[PDB]
Amino acid sequence: HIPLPGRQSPDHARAEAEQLAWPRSLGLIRSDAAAERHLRGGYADLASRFYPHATGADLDLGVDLMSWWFLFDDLFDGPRGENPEDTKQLTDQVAAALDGPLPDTAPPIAHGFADIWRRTCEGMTPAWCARSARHWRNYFDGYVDEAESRAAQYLAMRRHTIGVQPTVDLAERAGRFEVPHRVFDSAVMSAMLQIAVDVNLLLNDIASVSHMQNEVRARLEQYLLLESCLPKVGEIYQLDTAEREALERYRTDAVRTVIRGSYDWHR
Ligand SMILES: C/C(=C\CC/C(C)=C/COP(=O)(O)OP(=O)(O)O)CCC=C(CF)CF
Incomplete structure (x- = not known):
């Protein structure tokens, strides 16, 4: 039960046909068998549903993030994912791209993240990049915390490793807009983003138990309640015409898409 419209970028065919060129050029995919395993994931299709408002290079950046993220998560399914020290050793080299240029000795998965992070920040305000860099560190730190098992x-741990917030952040960059920063920090928007996080991880774990399905039903109903409060929220923070349009773009193209897009991709 998700009363949100399914949407998909009109440029999804070209983005899926060219999805392999970027990971091959950064050494993330080096064999034809690894390429076919990647195509079987449908990651470009997922990006076209997370970012239906993006085409061309903007959508390609969304495809690369999906390609990089599943290539990154697969590097921890072996013995390294069990040892928390080796998990932190790799995430530190990746997260170092948020602090400055990476040394040439960095693994390819690190140079891949740096190329994505460089493109994510182009054209965005300095305060937006600092907030988005903070969101990545929260994911990497939560990745190490989950390795310490x-x-x-389980909700307090999975809420950082589900990766919804960095996915939503890219929707702003892909749409070339920024939600008003004081509205992002609002209690209403935080509750909406917490619903998007909880629903995404409940749907991903589906891969006595009907209690989870009703939990998704309840949070989606609460999400609609919170959406109706946004007009009054815009007045509380004294939003102008352009800020209200960015807030509307954030509601439809970033928060709604991250909830509906994951459902249509799993199904
Ligand atoms: C919100 C996003 C995707 C929808 C939810 C998903 C698939 C989250 C991924 O959770 P995982 O712990 O990596 O288990 P999985 O590899 O899917 O078996 C984009 C982030 C992509 C990731 C891929 F690992 C995040 F981990």
């Missing part, structure tokens, strides 16, 4: 207790 070798109902409410």
